[PDB]
From a paper:
Human cellular retinol binding protein II ([name]) was used as a protein engineering platform to rationally regulate absorptive and emissive properties of a covalently bound fluorogenic dye. We demonstrate the binding of a thio-dapoxyl analog via formation of a protonated imine between an active site lysine residue and the chromophore’s aldehyde. Previously, we showed the utility of human [name] ([name]) mutants as a fluorophoric tag, wherein an active site lysine residue ([name]) reacts with synthetic aldehydic chromophores, giving rise to the formation of either an imine (Schiff base, SB) or an iminium (protonated SB, PSB). [name] functions as the active-site lysine and forms a Schiff base with the aldehyde, whereas the [name] mutation is assumed to eliminate interactions between [name] and Lys40, an interaction that could otherwise impede imine formation, and is also required to promote Schiff base protonation.
Gratifyingly, the red shifting properties of [name] and [name] to M1 were additive, resulting in 47 and 23 nm, absorption and emission red shifts, respectively (M8). Thus, the M8 template (Q108 K:[name]:[name]:[name]) was retained for further protein engineering. We first focused on the Arg58 position, introducing aromatic residues (M9-M12) to the parent tetramutant M8. However, results were disappointing with most mutations resulting in modest hypsochromic wavelength shifts. Nonetheless, we were able to successfully obtain a crystal structure of M11, which guided further engineering efforts. The tryptophan at position 58 does not sequester the binding pocket; instead, it flips inside, where it makes a cation - π interaction with the diethyl-amino group of TD-1V (3.7 Å). Additionally, comparison of the M10 and M11 structures shows that introduction of Trp58 results in an almost 90° rotation of the entire chromophore, altering the position and therefore interactions of the imine at the opposite end. A conserved water network connecting the hydroxyl group of Tyr19 and the thiophene sulfur atom of TD-1V was observed in the M11 crystal structure. The explanation for why only the combination of Y19W with [name] led to the significant change in spectral shift as opposed to the combination of R58H and Y19W is probably due to the nearly 90° rotation of the chromophore trajectory enforced by its interaction with Trp58 for M11.
Numbering used by the authors: 1 to 133
The structure:
């Protein structure tokens, strides 16, 4: 389904280290971040999204409209400028972050009571699964 509204708690986290390493996040930041469970919070109305990502170590929010390109500065992730665009492919929400890194972005979708997130950068894929609280 396309409805991603909700509060979502991490159930699983695969290869978050590979993705962060791919983004050139410094070793000491990675080593702590890879160990952590994350939470996502998502308000979606029409094509308007507000999303918040949290752990004990960080707390980030981003707002975007489906189909409207926007500049991003990924401050206190890897600190780069990208041009982001979020669109639908069927019921999969796809973000491309155009910039220095190839294959950078993410895909998000719902299966049952769960939210699936694929984070990509270069040749690394990170998969996370969240349950609807």
């Amino acid at each position: 389904t396309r409805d991603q509204n909700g509060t979502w708690e991490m159930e699983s986290n695969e290869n978050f280290e590979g993705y962060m390493k791919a983004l050139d996040i410094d070793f000491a930041t990675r080593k702590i971040a890879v160990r952590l469970t994350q939470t996502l919070v998502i308000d979606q109305d029409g094509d308007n999204f507000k999303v918040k990502s949290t752990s004990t170590f960080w707390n980030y929010d981003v707002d975007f409209t489906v189909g409207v390109e926007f500049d991003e500065y990924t401050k206190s992730l890897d600190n780069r400028h990208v041009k982001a665009l979020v669109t639908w492919e069927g019921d999969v929400l796809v973000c491309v972050q155009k910039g220095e890194k190839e294959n950078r972005g993410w895909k998000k979708w719902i299966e049952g009571d769960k939210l699936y997130l694929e984070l990509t950068c270069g040749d690394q894929v990170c998969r996370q699964v969240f349950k609807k609280k």
